[PDB]
RNA sequence: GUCUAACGUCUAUGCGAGUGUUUGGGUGUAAAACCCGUACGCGUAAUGAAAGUGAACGAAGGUGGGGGCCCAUUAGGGUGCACCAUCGACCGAUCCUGAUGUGUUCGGAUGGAUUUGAGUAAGAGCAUAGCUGUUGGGACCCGAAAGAUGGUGAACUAUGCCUG
RNA sequence: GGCGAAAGACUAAUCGAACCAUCUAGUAGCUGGUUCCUGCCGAAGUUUCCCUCAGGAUAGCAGAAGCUCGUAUCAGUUUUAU
RNA sequence: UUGCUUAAUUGAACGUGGACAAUUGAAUGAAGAGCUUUUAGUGGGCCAUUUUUGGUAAGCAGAACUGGCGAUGCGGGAUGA
RNA sequence: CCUAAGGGGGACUCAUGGAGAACAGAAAUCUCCAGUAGAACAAAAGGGUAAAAGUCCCCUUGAUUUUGAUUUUCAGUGUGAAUACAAACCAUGAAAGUGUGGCCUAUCGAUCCUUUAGUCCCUCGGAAUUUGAGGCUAGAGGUGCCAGAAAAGUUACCACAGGGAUAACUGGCUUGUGGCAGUCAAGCGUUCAUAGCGACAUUGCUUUUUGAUUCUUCGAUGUCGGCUCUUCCUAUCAUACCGAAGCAGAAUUCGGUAAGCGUUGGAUUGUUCACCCACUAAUAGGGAACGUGAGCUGGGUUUAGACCGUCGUGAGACAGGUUAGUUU
RNA sequence: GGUUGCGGCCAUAUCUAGCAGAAAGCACCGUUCCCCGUUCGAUCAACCGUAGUUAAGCUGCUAAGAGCAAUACCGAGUAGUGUAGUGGGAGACCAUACGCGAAACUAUUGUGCUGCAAUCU
């Protein structure tokens, strides 16, 4: 899968309301905070005796992940998210196809 | 492994007629459908957008909605012990006016014409249709048609 | 163990005790799914039609 | 079964009058393996109506013991007597439908003399079902 | 365990509840004994009233602002305004509240 | 044997008598059983059937319902007939002079009818001044306003009321009632 | 297949935009019967996560039916409760527009939207009782192999010791 | 826990974890049973989901209560047209 | 009538007003049609004709439609779901 | 799997055959004609497609935004996928139009938690500011047992609830397999199809084989073999009377009527089976719940002890060998 | 009636091989400055209507033509099938009863019709 680093789609920003130029970037999940309430509840529940108090997933079945495109408007800096289908291979702004070339 | 996809078993139903593949004759795109029209449904395999499900291939229904390239048709489908109202969006390529309207709408006119004519003549006319009745008496002439006697034929082998 | 897989036997018997009933027809069908643009304008046409008939009867009363 | 129900034949040895057209002919063709039918003579109709003639009055089976019952129920169809009813049946008249539906299905007995050796085969093949025509009179004579 | 279109219930009966069931068979008996106690108290102190004079105070919260009810005792300022010492007031059938 | 085209030995499915053992309602049935049997007036046959109805099948008629029915064209002096209880409505601004025959009147209803110059009579008093129900107008209360009907025919995308004991944000609002929590039905 | 706590449907009864005396107080011929009232529960408003906002264009709407009633005179006309199908109006949430103005960032008039609510649209509920159905309880009756807590045994027997 | 020149053997006819009382009426999708008469109606082993496959929920089949009405407009059927 | 549509005075939808009366537009039947609430048991099935799959076949296994047994006695098939 | 293999527009026409052109040949490139698709369209197959949906070129991001309605599976729930519109914003083209991913039919994922984006909006409840936290809307992180628990073995020391809803005997259907018997007669038989045989085929019978199935029995019908004893079958090993011969005699072989009558003693083996020795007229084959354990026996199998080999980290396994093991 | 432009139905119109075509139309045809596109003015673009031709296109006719279309004392009431029997047959299968009812084959006939606008011996 090859995706260009720029794209002109609709901008939901109140200033734009139109197709503008965007910068394509791969979305990266943020760092897990220690003060999220769930992360707060989980740490308290595991404390003391009782062992592991929540489940740990083992039976992995997916072999890919859904790639998410981070589209940042060059005009107003509003970000947008686009999920793609499941792809194993993926490059951003790779070499475009050349049709007619020899082996 | 069982297979139960959207167009499963439609190998022959959705085929074009023999020597009738290709471009659509343009009377299909010139017909006008109004809400309340009775239309036959027959999926055209060469147009895959707005295509009916295989259940509606061969069904007849009422137009309820008219859009840019499609009509909405109301179909009554049996689900268990009752009917459920189904609303199918179909492009006009899969739709044709039902010919059952034109026979009944003409019989209404013929009854109206017959009623006024008998009314004009001050007489009566009966407009109810009748099933075929047993035939009356008749006389068979035998000039040139004297009965010919037949008999069952013996068995023969022709190979 | 192994059991019976599937059968439609006796299912038409059960559907015909109280069902196989055609749906009732009504003078006005529901406009659900009708084109929004037509439906938007059809609202204004009916309201104006009611006003004209209301005025025509109001003339023919007083 | 539905065809026999629509003919009001919901028991064995029940008899009904049918005016021959196409719709009713295809009906009787569907019920053919279960019925014996034929063309009734005037005397057969008279005897049937006289001995086993009943009317449907308020969904009740009422004996036709007086011409007032027939008049009160079929005078709008110009039937004023038991002989008017028999005439309307025999020469199939404009009000055959009303007269035959007013008539309760005839509840006949079994034949005096029995059936053939095996009933449930066509009259042509030596059985009893199907069209026996003028021999319906003999069959009715056996059963009424 | 879950069946039909019915409301989902919260019947808290999973502990050993039957060892802690208090049935008030003695409601009338306590009523009668309360009346007898009350008569005894009156006859003990007659003609002194059985009830101390209570103040009138506004009920707290936005829900009971409108209502006004009987308090616990008259404030020190209130008793001061009528020239009664709290130590003396408690002995003549007047209730005191140092807190209000 | 018979090939039965209908179910055998089936009761009519309609009440032929009140379920109530109140002797005074029975006396009213006594009177209109005689009237329905002998007058050919369709009014008396309707009243006899209505006297059999259960409490939910004779919903209360507010004194406001009677006012709107008397406001029909040419119905201002008709006799209002309510087979049931007539209740008061403290949301009315005014009430006309009217004759109303009912099974029961509330204290407010009886006060209001008589305060405005009207009459509050029973259904037996109706049968003497109108033995055929002449110039009458039968008023029935709302049947689908009952609280139990809110939960009837509940299902996905049916818009009916769930059978629930508590109401709030924590009670049947998350999954199946919201697209942010899966789906919505 | 019970009793009980809390419930669904249906039915009977009392009162009814209210309803429920029994926690308690009065009273008594004393666990009864009789009487009393403040609160409170449910209902009388909904909707939104919330800040919050909060139900009439009109005879409380239009159309086709609708029992009964009125005028007729086969037929026909009027009026049409309950209820049915359909198109609308109002309230809340969501989105769009954004007046005079202003702590210049607030305010939100006005007009809209194939959106949405367990709503309004001349209240119907509350209480008692009964059958049936539900859940928790031993839970229709009888039934484990197991688990835990606290105690009793080396008069048999295993092993050490002491003495024969 | 003991004890075992070791068999999972002995520990009061009890041992691959004694005996006694209690928690305890422990739980059981499993087996067994489930008490009077007559009258009327009268099934299902099929759909979907479930660590679901001897079980449930769900829809269907059935009963009960009825309600709005009284030939309105319905049918496991035929005819004609398509 | 409309804010939809047409180049339009064109259409679309919903309407006002008028005409067509019991052969008001096939047959046959109709212990009438329509509607609501609530709940039991069941969720092992099997057989016959016909269609039919695997298998050499099976009183085998599996489907289609109907009728039965299960849940059902009575006359016949001696006997037999 | 694909920034094109998506979208729009334009031009052209594929597989293949024939006839020709230096090196050039079966296969290089060029030309004309024919060419209904006999190709190509990511992938499995089906459908669909010719001035295209195929090949090439140009421009692009509609593979975008807000959410409703609908179709399939369906309980008319979810999920997936798809359809026709409404309101936007765009691409392309002269335009009409088309485009809301892949020509269509498959290509995928709830609650709880976390993370990102959006609104920069609501709340942190004595009042505020700023951090921090919590809300609302949309994605992602994943459950493949795919309507979605967090999970290694052994028991030959074993337990419980049950099940003939289900295996290990007999019995029952079947008869593939096993066994036995026919018909046709090309051949064998010095000549000579049928004295005696008999291929390629084909029709049957049997239930002493093994399968197939799972109907009966799991609140138990004692599941190997032998000893002992009775009866029955005939597909007859011997004995009676006969027919046939490639019957001279003697011997032998085939057959008919025939189950009246008999069909053994031993070495090895738990054996059934087998194999050897020997006698004999002959040492035929079977059944009777694979007859026969309240008749026996108990050598085998199949509890618990123990040894060995192989396997296992181990506890332990072996349908492998070995020894000891209550027959009411 | 012919011809052209735009069509409806989409072979009775297609395919092969011959022959004919007045008038107009259409067409081939001549040229490259310009817009435009090509290896190539072959296609596409433009110019002239001037120099020529019905040779081709197109149109019509011909063919025991192929194909297509229609019809039927053609085959055939055959094959199949709905329904029935305590019918036949060891079976495989078959007959009968009340109904429905093909395809191939054979023979014959036909070979575009038509709508809007313009034009012509
Ligand atoms: C080290 C390891 O690999 O084990 C992790 C374990 O550490 C992890 O525990 C996390 C713990 O797990 C949970 O509380 C569960 C909440 C929701 C469940 C699950 C985890 O996430 C799921 C499953 C599935 O996705 C996942 O599984 C997400 C894993 C994760 C890992 C790290 C942080 C957050 C989530 C759904 C998509 C979302 O929802 C959910 C329903 O099953 O949450 C804390 C916040 C974390 O700190 C904690 O992670 C750490 C650093 O130890 O949970 C995973 C299942 C395990 O695989
Ligand atoms: C005492 C019994 C009975 O129970 C039994 O009845 O008769 C003998 C048994 C049982 C079976 C015949 C059982 O039925 C069955 O069906 C299958 C087989 C192989 C079993 C063989 C044998 O095996 C046993 O272990 C127990 C024995
Ligand atoms: Mg943006
Ligand atoms: Mg959070
Ligand atoms: Mg710690
Ligand atoms: Mg702890
Ligand atoms: Mg802990
Ligand atoms: Mg496979
Ligand atoms: Mg398949
Ligand atoms: Mg087809
Ligand atoms: Mg598509
Ligand atoms: Mg569709
Ligand atoms: Mg007439
Ligand atoms: Mg199982
Ligand atoms: Mg099953
Ligand atoms: Mg009749
Ligand atoms: Mg006799
Ligand atoms: Mg006889
Ligand atoms: Mg006879
Ligand atoms: Mg006989
Ligand atoms: Mg006989
Ligand atoms: Mg007689
Ligand atoms: Mg009887
Ligand atoms: Mg309400
Ligand atoms: Mg209301
Ligand atoms: Mg109150
Ligand atoms: Mg009391
Ligand atoms: Mg006392
Ligand atoms: Mg609030
Ligand atoms: Mg909100
Ligand atoms: Mg200003
Ligand atoms: Mg300003
Ligand atoms: Mg301003
Ligand atoms: Mg202001
Ligand atoms: Mg609403
Ligand atoms: Mg209300
Ligand atoms: Mg118990
Ligand atoms: Mg219980
Ligand atoms: Mg209980
Ligand atoms: Mg116990
Ligand atoms: Mg434990
Ligand atoms: Mg000792
Ligand atoms: Mg010991
Ligand atoms: Mg010693
Ligand atoms: Mg210890
Ligand atoms: Mg110790
Ligand atoms: Mg051991
Ligand atoms: Mg002891
Ligand atoms: Mg002991
Ligand atoms: Mg011991
Ligand atoms: Mg189970
Ligand atoms: Mg019955
Ligand atoms: Mg069982
Ligand atoms: Mg259930
Ligand atoms: Mg069903
Ligand atoms: Mg009807
Ligand atoms: Mg037809
Ligand atoms: Mg009109
Ligand atoms: Mg007809
Ligand atoms: Mg129900
Ligand atoms: Mg139920
Ligand atoms: Mg039910
Ligand atoms: Mg149920
Ligand atoms: Mg149940
Ligand atoms: Mg079974
Ligand atoms: Mg079961
Ligand atoms: Mg048969
Ligand atoms: Mg048959
Ligand atoms: Mg079977
Ligand atoms: Mg079975
Ligand atoms: Mg049968
Ligand atoms: Mg049973
Ligand atoms: Mg029977
Ligand atoms: Mg018998
Ligand atoms: Mg018998
Ligand atoms: Mg027999
Ligand atoms: Mg493509
Ligand atoms: Mg493209
Ligand atoms: Mg393209
Ligand atoms: Mg193109
Ligand atoms: Mg995508
Ligand atoms: Mg699914
Ligand atoms: Mg759905
Ligand atoms: Mg659904
Ligand atoms: Mg869905
Ligand atoms: Mg879906
Ligand atoms: Mg678009
Ligand atoms: Mg604050
Ligand atoms: Mg998610
Ligand atoms: Mg997810
Ligand atoms: Mg699962
Ligand atoms: Mg697991
Ligand atoms: Mg061992
Ligand atoms: Mg073992
Ligand atoms: Mg079994
Ligand atoms: Mg064999
Ligand atoms: Mg064999
Ligand atoms: Mg066998
Ligand atoms: Mg067995
Ligand atoms: Mg057993
Ligand atoms: Mg026993
Ligand atoms: Mg025995
Ligand atoms: Mg044994
Ligand atoms: Mg022999
Ligand atoms: Mg013998
Ligand atoms: Mg020996
Ligand atoms: Mg030996
Ligand atoms: Mg051995
Ligand atoms: Mg052996
Ligand atoms: Mg045995
Ligand atoms: Mg045996
Ligand atoms: Mg055997
Ligand atoms: Mg044995
Ligand atoms: Mg024995
Ligand atoms: Mg023994
Ligand atoms: Mg033995
Ligand atoms: Mg003995
Ligand atoms: Mg042994
Ligand atoms: Mg041994
Ligand atoms: Mg051992
Ligand atoms: Mg090892
Ligand atoms: Mg081995
Ligand atoms: Mg071993
Ligand atoms: Mg050895
Ligand atoms: Mg020993
Ligand atoms: Mg013993
Ligand atoms: Mg001409
Ligand atoms: Mg010329
Ligand atoms: Mg040129
Ligand atoms: Mg050009
Ligand atoms: Mg030419
Ligand atoms: Mg020429
Ligand atoms: Mg020709
Ligand atoms: Mg030809
Ligand atoms: Mg046949
Ligand atoms: Mg026979
Ligand atoms: Mg025939
Ligand atoms: Zn922007």
UniProtKB/TrEMBL annotation, chain A:
**Gene3D superfamilies documented for this protein:** 3.10.450.80
Per UniProt, where does Mg(2+) 3 bind? 47
List, alphabetically, the Pfam families matched: Ribosomal_L44
Where does the chain bind Mg(2+) 4? 49
Where does the chain bind Mg(2+) 2? 11, 22
Question: A Gene Ontology CC term for this entry?
Answer: ribonucleoprotein complex
Give the record's family classification.
Belongs to the eukaryotic ribosomal protein eL42 family.
User: Mind telling me what this protein is named?
Assistant: 60S ribosomal protein L42-B
The gene is RPL42B
TrEMBL record, chain D:
Entry binding sites for Mg(2+) 1: 17
Question: What domain of life does the UniProt record list for this protein's source?
Answer: Eukaryota
Q: Which GO terms describe its biological process?
A: maturation of LSU-rRNA from tricistronic rRNA transcript (SSU-rRNA, 5.8S rRNA, LSU-rRNA)
Give the binding site residues for Mg(2+) 2: 117
Q: Which GO terms describe its cellular component?
A: cytosolic large ribosomal subunit
What's in the keyword line of the UniProt record? Metal-binding, Ribonucleoprotein, Ribosomal protein
- Chain residues that bind Mg(2+) 3: 144
**Residues in domain Large ribosomal subunit protein uL30-like ferredoxin-like fold?**
1-35
One GO molecular-function annotation for this sequence? RNA binding
What is stated as this protein's family in its record? Answer: Belongs to the universal ribosomal protein uL30 family.
Q: What is this protein called?
A: 60S ribosomal protein L7-A
UniProtKB/TrEMBL annotation, chain E:
Q: Where does Mg(2+) bind?
A: 29
Family that this chain belongs to: Belongs to the eukaryotic ribosomal protein eL13 family.
**Protein name according to UniProt:** 60S ribosomal protein L13
Gene name, per UniProt, is: RPL13
Automatic annotation (TrEMBL), chain F:
The record's PROSITE patterns line, in alphabetical order, gives: RIBOSOMAL_L18E (PS01106)
Question: Has UniProt tagged this entry with the keyword Ribonucleoprotein?
Answer: yes
Q: Would you identify the family this protein belongs to, as annotated?
A: Belongs to the eukaryotic ribosomal protein eL18 family.
Positions contributing to Mg(2+) binding: 113
Q: Which SUPFAM superfamilies match?
A: Ribosomal proteins L15p and L18e
Kindly state which keywords UniProt assigns to this record, in alphabetical order.
Answer: Metal-binding, Ribonucleoprotein, Ribosomal protein
Q: Which species is this record about?
A: Candida albicans
What is this protein called in UniProt? 60S ribosomal protein L18-A
Query: Which GO annotations describe the biological process of this protein?
Result: translation
> Could you name the Gene Ontology cellular component terms for this entry?
cytosolic large ribosomal subunit
A Gene Ontology molecular function term for this protein is:
RNA binding
Q: Which residues form the Large ribosomal subunit protein uL15/eL18 domain?
A: 3-185
């Amino acid at each position: 899968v090859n995706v260009p680093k720029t794209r002109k789609t609709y901008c939901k920003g109140k200033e734009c309301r139109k197709h503008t130029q965007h910068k394509v970037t791969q979305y990266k999940a943020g760092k897990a905070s220690l003060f999220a309430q769930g992360k707060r509840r989980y740490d308290r529940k595991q404390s003391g005796y009782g062992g592991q108090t929540k489940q740990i997933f083992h039976k992995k079945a997916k072999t890919t992940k859904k790639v998410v495109l981070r589209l940042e408007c060059v005009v107003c800096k509003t970000k947008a998210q686009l999920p793609l289908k499941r792809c194993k291979h993926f490059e951003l702004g790779g070499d475009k196809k050349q049709k007619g070339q020899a082996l | 492994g069982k297979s139960r996809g959207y167009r499963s078993g439609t190998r022959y139903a959705f085929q074009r007629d023999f020597k009738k593949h290709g471009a659509i004759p343009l009377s299909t795109y010139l017909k006008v459908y109004k809400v309340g029209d009775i239309v036959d449904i027959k999926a055209n395999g060469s147009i895959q957008k707005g295509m009916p499900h295989k259940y509606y291939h061969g069904k007849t229904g009422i137009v309820y909605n008219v859009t840019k390239s499609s009509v909405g048709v109301i179909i009554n489908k049996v689900v268990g012990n009752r009917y459920i109202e189904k609303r199918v969006n179909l492009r006009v390529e899969h739709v044709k006016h039902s010919a059952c309207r034109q026979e009944f709408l003409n019989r209404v006119k013929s009854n109206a014409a017959k009623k006024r004519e008998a009314k004009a003549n001050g007489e009566t006319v009966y407009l109810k249709r009748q099933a075929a009745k047993p035939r009356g008496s008749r006389i068979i002439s035998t000039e040139g048609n004297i009965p010919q006697t037949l008999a069952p034929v013996a068995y023969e082998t022709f190979i | 163990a192994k059991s019976k897989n599937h059968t439609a036997h006796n299912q038409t018997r059960k559907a015909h005790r109280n069902g196989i009933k055609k749906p009732k027809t009504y003078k006005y069908p529901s406009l659900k799914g009708v084109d929004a643009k037509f439906k938007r304008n059809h609202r204004y046409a009916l309201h104006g039609t009611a006003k004209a008939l209301a005025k025509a009867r109001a003339e023919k009363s007083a | 079964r539905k065809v026999l129900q629509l003919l009001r034949l919901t028991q064995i040895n029940a008899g009904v009058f049918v005016r021959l057209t196409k719709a009713t002919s295809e009906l009787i063709k569907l019920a053919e393996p279960y019925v014996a039918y034929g063309y009734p003579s005037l005397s057969t109709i008279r005897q049937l109506v006289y001995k086993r003639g009943f009317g449907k009055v308020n969904k009740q089976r009422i004996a036709l013991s007086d011409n007032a019952i027939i008049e009160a129920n079929l005078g709008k169809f110009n039937i004023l007597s038991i002989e008017d009813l028999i005439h309307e049946i025999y020469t199939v008249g404009p009000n055959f439908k009303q007269v035959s539906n007013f008539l309760w299905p005839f509840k006949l007995s079994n034949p005096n003399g029995g059936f053939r050796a095996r009933k449930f085969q066509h009259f042509i093949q030596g059985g009893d079902t199907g069209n026996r025509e003028q021999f319906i009179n003999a069959l009715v004579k056996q059963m009424n | 365990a879950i069946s039909k279109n019915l409301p989902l219930l919260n019947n808290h009966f999973r502990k050993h509840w039957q060892e802690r069931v208090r049935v008030h068979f003695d409601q009338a008996g306590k009523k009668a004994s309360r009346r007898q106690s009350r008569l005894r108290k009156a006859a003990k102190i007659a003609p002194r009233p059985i009830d101390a004079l209570r103040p009138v105070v506004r009920a707290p919260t936005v829900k009971y602002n409108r209502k006004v009810r009987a308090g616990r005792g008259f404030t020190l300022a209130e008793l001061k305004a009528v020239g009664i010492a709290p130590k003396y007031a408690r002995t003549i059938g007047i209730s005191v509240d140092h807190r209000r | 044997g018979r090939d039965h085209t209908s179910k055998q030995h089936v009761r009519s499915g309609h009440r032929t008598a009140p379920k109530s053992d109140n002797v005074y309602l029975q006396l009213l049935v006594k009177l209109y059983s005689f009237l329905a049997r002998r007058t050919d007036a369709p009014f008396n046959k309707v009243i006899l059937k209505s006297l059999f109805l259960s409490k939910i099948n004779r919903p209360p008629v507010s004194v406001s319902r009677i006012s709107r029915a008397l406001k029909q064209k040419g119905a201002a002096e008709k006799t209002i007939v309510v087979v049931g209880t007539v209740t008061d409505d403290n949301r009315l601004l005014e009430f006309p002079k009217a004759t109303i025959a009912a099974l029961r009147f509330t204290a407010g209803a009886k006060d209001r009818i008589l305060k405005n110059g009207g009459e509050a009579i029973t259904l037996d008093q109706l049968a003497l001044r109108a033995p055929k129900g002449q110039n009458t107008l039968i008023v029935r209360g709302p049947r689908n306003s009952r609280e139990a009907v809110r939960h009837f025919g509940f299902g996905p995308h049916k818009g009916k009321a769930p059978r629930i004991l508590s109401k709030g944000r924590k009670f049947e609002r998350a999954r199946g009632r919201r697209r942010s929590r899966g789906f919505k039905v």
